[PDB]
Design a binder for this molecule. Structure first.
Ligand SMILES: Nc1ncnc2c1ncn2[C@@H]1O[C@H](CSCC[C@H](N)C(=O)O)[C@@H](O)[C@H]1O
Ligand SMILES: Nc1ncnc2c1ncn2[C@@H]1O[C@H](CSCC[C@H](N)C(=O)O)[C@@H](O)[C@H]1O
Lengths: 208, 212
């Protein structure tokens, strides 16, 4: 049996690469994006009622995932290389209009094709008795060079995004060598940082 | 300007107590007797693909609504079964597994459901404590259930024959109130059984008969 699916829309995302995408995205509220809905579902009628829903599940295609074991069985993990290649994420819904959802705390790559939107239903989706021994790091302290703080603010005004907060929230989640400069792309920016101490990240510069 | 298309195929099929949509409990995880298996098709029937699930109590299943608009109120504000791309998402309790079989508890899946994916439930990522949903179906309040001596005898006899908790499943689905009328007869199919009941009072279900 084969079943054909097609995207209802595509993600526009802060994240351009898989590296600094936080392992706990709901602790990164500055990780924002939009879901641009495709012409059939771009009518506000398809969204009515979501004004009373804070979080939504997105089923999507791992389009940048280019598999039965993972060095752990594939079905015991959330690996991106898996049969049928469908991902599942719960993100916070900040608002919506005809043909667009505003999202926060996302873990989705830019351009991600979305297959479905489901409202998060707490009594059904939040399993209090759930345990998982296979499944997080506490988080590293983040410090700013004075130059980078000014640059994050300027680009935050230009992009109308919480750039400084996003940089801090992704670096704090431990995306190892002293002296070496590291980098990541966020929106249209290149962010550089280093490890002055093994337990401290310092943001060097924000360019774009 | 052309629509992207992606082909998916089942990794396996669900074998389920439930044969019809009626009386499937609204809160399936409070119905541990709602049991079923996922029969995995090759090459996904190898024990290697399951290693580690011994440490995971609950799993997500992505599946096809194989038993078949935007108005439903909006389709994306609901968990309706008729939806674009026709993919369902349920979290079930994982009781155990072997090569090519998962034992599931608290399912809400129809028999024969084609499953597309298995994901481990990850509490820090999947359990949103601050989540709110006003448009959701409120969890069922609960109705009282009483048994005819005949129906309880048959339910336990069929429970031994089927080697399933038939009586427990009956009680757990009826206690969540499938939904009036007083002289009308209602039923639900469980495995190969037909269970019959009625409402002697508006707040009381009486199980009448179990046939099969
Ligand atoms: N469109 C995409 N294609 C491939 N990988 C993606 C992707 N979008 C996000 N990812 C990856 O998904 C990784 C975390 S897991 C995200 C998938 C989903 N949360 C699930 O549990 O199924 C992210 O860190 C990122 O590396
Ligand atoms: N295989 C199937 N095909 C069509 N409907 C199904 C089905 N399996 C279960 N259902 C229906 O799905 C209802 C549960 S709600 C929808 C399924 C899933 N929990 C989700 O949230 O996406 C069941 O009570 C039954 O009415």
């Amino acid at each position: 049996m084969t079943h054909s699916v097609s995207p209802i829309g595509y993600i526009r995302s802060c994240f351009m690469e898989k590296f600094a995408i936080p392992r706990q995205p709901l602790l990164a509220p500055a990780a924002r994006g939009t879901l641009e809905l495709l012409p059939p579902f771009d009518q506000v009628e398809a969204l009515e009622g979501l004004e009373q829903v804070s979080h939504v599940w997105l089923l999507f295609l791992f389009h940048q995932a280019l598999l039965k074991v993972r060095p752990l069985g594939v079905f015991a993990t959330r690996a991106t290389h898996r049969p049928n290649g469908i991902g599942q994420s719960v993100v916070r819904l900040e608002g919506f209009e005809a043909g667009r959802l505003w999202l926060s705390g996302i873990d989705l790559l830019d351009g991600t094709p979305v297959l479905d939107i489901k409202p998060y239903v707490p009594y059904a989706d939040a399993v209090a008795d759930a345990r998982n021994g296979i499944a997080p790091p506490p988080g590293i302290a983040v410090e700013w060079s004075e130059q980078a703080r000014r640059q994050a603010h300027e680009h935050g005004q230009r992009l109308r995004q919480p750039v400084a907060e996003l940089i801090e929230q992704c670096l704090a989640q431990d995306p190892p060598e002293p002296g070496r400069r590291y980098g990541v792309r966020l929106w249209d920016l290149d962010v550089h940082w280093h490890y002055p101490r093994p337990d401290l990240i310092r943001v060097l510069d924000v360019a774009g």
